[model samples]
Target chain A: SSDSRYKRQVSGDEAYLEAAPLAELHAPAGMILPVTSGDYAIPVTNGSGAVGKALDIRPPAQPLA
Target chain B: VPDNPPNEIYATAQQKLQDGNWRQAITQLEALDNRYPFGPYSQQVQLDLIYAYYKNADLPLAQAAIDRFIRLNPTHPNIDYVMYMRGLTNMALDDSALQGFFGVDRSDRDPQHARAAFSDFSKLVRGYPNSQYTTDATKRLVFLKDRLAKYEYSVAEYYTERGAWVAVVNRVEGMLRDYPDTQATRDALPLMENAYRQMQMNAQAEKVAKIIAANSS
Candidate 1:
């Protein structure tokens, strides 16, 4: 559930920046959002420079539902 | 017991002043000053009284009050108001002198009134360089200077019309030298060039033509 919540939050952040102007979209404080339907989390990356690059995503296995 | 009443009197005087009861306001202020010779609001009340007298059209009384304010508080934070009132007093006197039957005819017929207003406005600019009123006063000074230049240029055009080449030359030269930034100066250029050509001053005419060309470009 927590992972899913994280994914939804990431999706919202990405969508907001995408719809904004380029000047407004680019965050001075580097961040990026990753979205997934079932489980999600904003993995802390090295920096904003790593944005748009592939990263490892691992989910804890638990049918807590 | 408090020896003097400050706030109550000041409030009453201010209320009277705002209500257009200049006489009542003046009376209250005078009483306040007399009653509280060293009151905290005494100086401020004096300033209010000066404005009341001025609003009541009692020029001499207003002048006295303003003079007193200036003398007592030469370095007051609001000395600009005193200077402005002094200019206003002088302007009122000028208007009076220009209001008679013959005075009306001679007012602008002679340039005295315009010159006086120009001088007063100039003083306001020089004395209050950073004042709130400075911007508007500077604009008015520019307008007056422009009007005066145009009047002189009209006289020059008269000379041009009558084939008075020497007079035209002098007037145009004066406009260019003294009123270079004026619209009259701009309009005078072509007339000056034509006049110079007519007078056989070909070099001068060519110089003016080049100036006009440079300006257009």
Candidate 2:
């Protein structure tokens, strides 16, 4: 079976990566990794009168090279 | 420093609570309880303290505060609110257990935690008969019971994967006896029949299949 890749912006400092097939993401014992990738800058508005850019991306890396 | 500082404190505490500043609200209420040991709003302040702790997801703190309030104000006019806060604390604890039961993947078969939560909610209902939150709590209690049973059925599925017919039968039977109203029971009956047939209990399997069919119709 073929697998599809999905990329979306998610808020968090770490990305939860699954080693098994994407379909196995819901598996009870799927291998998981918490990884940090290069940051993607996204604009954020603070409650105060300041606007600043923040890192908003944590792309998952493959388990093995 | 007003004549009714406790009332003023309570009003500000309630406002912070409504704004979702739970920890600040708890601080204000606790300060009121300490400063005005004999204030008219002391009991209500304690009640709000329980609520603030609960909203902050500090279950043990919420439960302890509620226990103190109930112990001190046994004859308070709004005893139901105290009971309701206790029930809410139990419900919050149960919610975490329920999430672990349902949110985890099928491979992690841990239904006992879910059952324990259901049992906790049952105690809440039995202890507080006339609580104003009784009706809502009762409804959620039923759902939790059903979910706990469903979790057992999921564990049975794990056993079935390993050809453990005996384990499957035991789990399904317990679920049927305890949670007949649950949707899990409907799924369980068919799986039980399949397990029986795999175990060469053909007659029992046929009988259970007929029962399931009849129930569905």
Candidate 3:
């Protein structure tokens, strides 16, 4: 049986996406998926964070051309 | 620690580092550290050990040394080098893509290390303005900024294609504000303009469009 720790990588040009599992991948600490799969628009409680920490969450920063 | 007096051990270890004999330098330094924990040459030995670990490609060890030293000696006059070295260590852990694109070539999960590295570099530049390593860290930060700018633009595209208009604007606007000088702004401008048009914010959309066109000017 294959271990479930492996994730299927699905990607290609816009024309198609393929899933392949290699023996290795990089999964260092504190990493997040570029896009966590399977849904959108999940709801959450508002104003639940500490006061004075209301900066809207943002992607850390952006790139070049 | 060399059985020789502390300063002599310093000369030997320093010579080894100069020769790029990283592991040997680490060995000599570790010995020095064990025998004379707080001797006269101790602080210099700690710094050299960190560099030796870094040069030996023991990055986790290097970072451990850096974090430990910084915590214990945060206000040392020569402390700027540790912060600078920390940034270098972070950059080593987080490299860029094969070539230029807003694309981060994170063979690892996603981008926490890269962002953390970016933060280290940025913080070093801000906090260590007069440090000798400041110029080198600043140059690397420019490259990192370009990498990160492109990343945000692509993420903006991701949101727009998925019908996340509001998300696109926040990210796109962020790109404009934070990394407008990067060539990735070319991609970001189009995405932001389109998102504005999609949300019926035609006035804002035109402003972005003009800037996009005026990029050459």
Candidate 4:
């Protein structure tokens, strides 16, 4: 019996990604869909954590003489 | 327990830190910080507490202390070290000993913390070029860039597996363009060529083969 093509792959380096049983002629446009399927995932708290001042990322230091 | 003098508490904390008793040091440091938040020992207490939390594997608390210290003392003499520790703490969060032992490549995993570490290290390298930690930070940036590039390649590989030739080519191109110096760029050459062939673009496939041949030396 042909079961659901999509199964969640928990093992391997691919972690918890929805995977097809094999690379068959499934009309799957893409693998590894977003975690939030159709809905947008939101954070628990939604406040901008604006620290007083931002630090600058400068260029590498000149070679020591 | 009665509030011990700040100096005595600081000494106790230092003693515990020296003895490698991170939890005990944390308690002493925390008490010292709360009691004498504006005293001579305040700065040292925060720094020591951050290190203690880091060594004890309490990463979130370590990050909290590091952020607080950086915000409060941005121009402190040891600010470079604090930033380096911040990067280290974030890297530790992404790192897993068991994964390393199992030879698990984390490229496919979400690299949120790794990206944070990369940003932190990048800022340290650029902001404090002469810092003692800059050398190690520079080295780690190479590793992080490699991993991040590999992450992009993994996504490309996903498209290839799905037989999405156009997407595979586009993503491989993205990886090559953004991470040209990374190992992933070399590793992705064959995938892109294969993708081109699958799409019947013989000319592009042949061009990729020539590029691969040039790199053979």
Candidate 5:
């Protein structure tokens, strides 16, 4: 009966390599940002010389003046 | 500049965007968003800001804009496109043009963002099968799947290099189960067999060796 590595000792990094601190961002005042539960824009036309995926902005139809 | 109307600000941003000047475009659009955050043009303004941030390599801001849009406009008509861009944003964060330039193998790097991209694309395909971006998202999902498997294999290899035979065996076995169709799965078999051999598990080693040979044939 051999012991499984699940419990057995395994060999393993850094010379105290601290990750560069993440950039700090402050939320604006008086803004209670909306709902949670987590979630997750853009348009580029070919003539615009867009390199990546073409972004399409669907603006709401506005009234004509 | 005088306090411009939302439409005028939007028009300014549009010009900068057309000229591929993402920095100025972001500046202009941010102004529009601040002044008219809930008007008719806000939708387009947010979308432009997302793209502008992405083009400017400001992934964090792009991500924030994307989440803000989705939260505010859960049922927006272009939600699918926004979702797809979110996946792309995640992918961009994971990708390393710098690493690629130096020929660094990213399989050895932290894959947090790749996993995020995988989740993003997976959600898109599952939620919006009819989306125009579905095809590209599916393709990127396959790539991320392979990338994740490769990272697992790299970890297994590290275990092998450290003479952690049992750890190597378990890690490679997990790779096999989780990434059966991945190239990393096939490449990882030899590492598993060698680990078993090092542990004096001759029977398991032979089994792995046979499987490896059969796989090559």
Candidate 6:
């Protein structure tokens, strides 16, 4: 049986670099902190001004003053 | 930095850290972590790698290291420090300026990282209230609270200009709900009130106004 280069023997950085069908990957969605997780949702929004996604951000719940 | 066995990697990496050679430390530290995943230095290597990654402005790597540490030992004695660094790492991730707004670069106003940072610091404060890192973490929360609120207002402001009163309400309500104590809420009250009035929801508008009046600083 052949092993899948995409998964087997793949290290952290290797798995990311070897993403096949590049179109299937959201290559632009950069990290908030580049923690390699199952879902790297933190988009790379700064610097490029690519308008990746409109960051409709909100604050944490705070005490009513 | 020395060229010795894996056992020597930690010491060499520590030297790199002492020299403020963060990028160099990262290379050595990463090697150390890979080689000694189950070694005595496993814990220290994780912490050092995170600091090196953070100092190198590698936010993602820092987050990964911190996340791994958190999952590995939730009850570790120095866990508070881990959370503190987590807050700092998240804060380093910036947001861009929103579109359709004045020349304001919306990137730095990102709410996700700010919200995450706030949560990180809050957890640290609650978990280890007397931790030495708590003071600075609290100070950061002050700024994070404001930044988070600003992010919402920035959105509300855009929604207002587009006559998306519904969106404005959603945004302002989010701001009020998430960061009621933030000064941005004060700035947001009028936007919410006006949006409600525009939608002919006079009752809701007046109710918002009343709340704002009572909470105004």
- Per-candidate DockQ values are 0.01, 0.01, 0.02, 0.02, 0.02, 0.02
Residue pairs clashing in model 5 are: A43-A55, A43-A56, A44-A55
Quote the B-chain TM-score, candidate 6. Answer: 0.82
For model 2 the TM-score comes to 0.62
The candidate maximizing TM-score is 5
Off by over 4 Å in 5: A1-65, B101-104
Residue A16 in model 2: lDDT: 14
Deviation of model 6 at B173, angstroms = 2.6
TM-score of 5: 0.73
Name the lDDT value of residue A16 in candidate 6: 15
TM-score of 6: 0.66
Candidate 3, position B47, lDDT: 79
lDDT for each residue of candidate 5 in B76-188, tens digit (9 for 90 to 100): 66776777778778776766464433434664566788778877777766777665556556555555666676678778877778877787776665554444445666677
**lDDT pick, better of 4 and 6:** 4
Write one digit per residue (lDDT tens) for candidate 1, span B130-181: 5554443444345445556656777787778888878878766654545344
Give stretches of model 1 more than 4 Å off: A1-65, B1-78, B85-109
Count of clashing residue pairs in every prediction: 2, 0, 14, 0, 3, 12
Error of model 2, residue B103, in angstroms: 6.5
After TM-score superposition, the amount by which residue A24's alpha carbon in candidate 2 deviates from its true location, in angstroms, is: 36
The weakest ten consecutive residues by lDDT in model 5 chain B span: B95-104
Model 3 TM-score (2 dp): 0.64
Better of 5 and 6 by lDDT: 5
Per-prediction TM-score? 0.47, 0.62, 0.64, 0.71, 0.73, 0.66
Angstrom error of the Cα, residue B98, model 4: value is 3.2
What TM value does the first chain of each candidate achieve? 0.17, 0.15, 0.16, 0.15, 0.18, 0.16
Question: Which digits, one per residue and each the tens of the lDDT, describe model 6 over residues B1-217?
Answer: 3445765777788787766677788888887788768855766778777877876557799898788888888886667677877876676564311231233444235567776877777767766666545545554555455555566677778778888878677766554434344555667778777777786888877766665555555
Interface quality of candidate 4 as DockQ:
0.02
**What tens-digit string does per-residue lDDT give for candidate 2 at B40-129?**
577666666776786666778878877776677676645545554554456445444333333443312343444444454455456554
Tens digit per residue, CA lDDT, model 6, A1-65: 11232112211111111221112211223311222322112212212221111221111112221
lDDT, candidate 3, B126-145, per-residue tens? 66556445544454455555
